[PDB]
């Protein structure tokens, strides 16, 4: 996404677009993801939990448009789909909402770095930006409530990190938000991630290094007053990421 700007994949080169092939052969967009190493994309478990058959998924890198080709784009199959075993969902909140996709081209190759395909750095253990930090989100999600199709062009926006203390206020999310989550929103509630942006990156500049701080996970509505976007706090899951890769 709501608000923000249209972007191109060269400005977001770690961005992974994940689709699912349906019975009958139609393909639909599922979620975003982030390239963290040449063979590994990180995303959200909630994006796959209802259809956990890895053969059905297609992952694109270097892609700026939803339904047309981008020069330099690479297409991948999923070799291994790793969902978090302690994933659960409440009415609003999603817990341990993190997934790993090992990707492989039909030739058995991983991603080849380029102008439009790059990895994003992971954060260090229990190291996050201070609240109030401006961070970027990217995706093909809804631009407004009334959208019935996702936008054709990739989008990005900038939101500010919100403290756990603020996010757990009773008119925010109360105790439904936990310390393994990060909240972020626009101070004027004019821009946010929305449906279809799940799984995609929340990127902050840490020590001059662009870092994957969060994964789009949940939220009530989109750009709704006092209802931030909620993101999986990547820095908490480093042991899980390290043990599964």
């Amino acid at each position: 996404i709501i608000g923000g700007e249209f972007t191109t994949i060269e400005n977001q080169p770690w961005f992974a677009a994940i689709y699912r092939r349906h019975r009958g052969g139609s393909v639909t967009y599922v979620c975003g993801g982030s390239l963290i190493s040449p063979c590994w994309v990180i995303s959200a478990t909630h994006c796959f939990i209802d259809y956990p058959k890895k053969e059905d998924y297609i992952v694109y890198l270097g892609r700026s448009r939803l339904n047309s080709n981008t020069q330099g784009e690479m297409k991948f199959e999923v070799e291994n789909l790793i969902l978090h075993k302690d994933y659960s969902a409440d009415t609003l909140a999603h817990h341990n909402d993190i997934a790993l996709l090992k990707i492989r081209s039909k030739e058995g190759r991983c991603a080849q770095p380029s102008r439009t395909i790059q990895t994003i750095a992971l954060p260090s253990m229990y190291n996050d930006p201070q609240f109030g930090t401006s961070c970027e989100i990217t995706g093909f999600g809804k631009e407004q409530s009334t959208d019935y199709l996702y936008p054709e062009q990739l989008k990005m926006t900038v939101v500010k990190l919100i403290s756990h203390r603020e996010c757990q206020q009773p008119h925010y999310y109360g105790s439904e938000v936990t310390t393994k989550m990060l909240c972020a929103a626009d101070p004027q509630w004019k821009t946010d991630s929305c449906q279809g942006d799940s799984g995609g990156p929340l990127v902050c500049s840490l020590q001059g290094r662009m870092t994957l701080t969060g994964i789009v996970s949940w939220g009530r509505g989109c750009a709704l007053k006092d209802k931030p976007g909620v993101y999986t706090r990547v820095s908490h899951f480093l042991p899980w990421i390290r043990s599964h890769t």
Binding site: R20, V30, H46, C47, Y51, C194, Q195, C222
Partner: peptide
């Protein structure tokens, strides 16, 4: 019911 971020690619969506 099950709408928005968290509910992509769900039967309940």
């Amino acid at each position: 019911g099950x709408l928005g971020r968290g509910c992509e690619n769900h039967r309940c969506l």
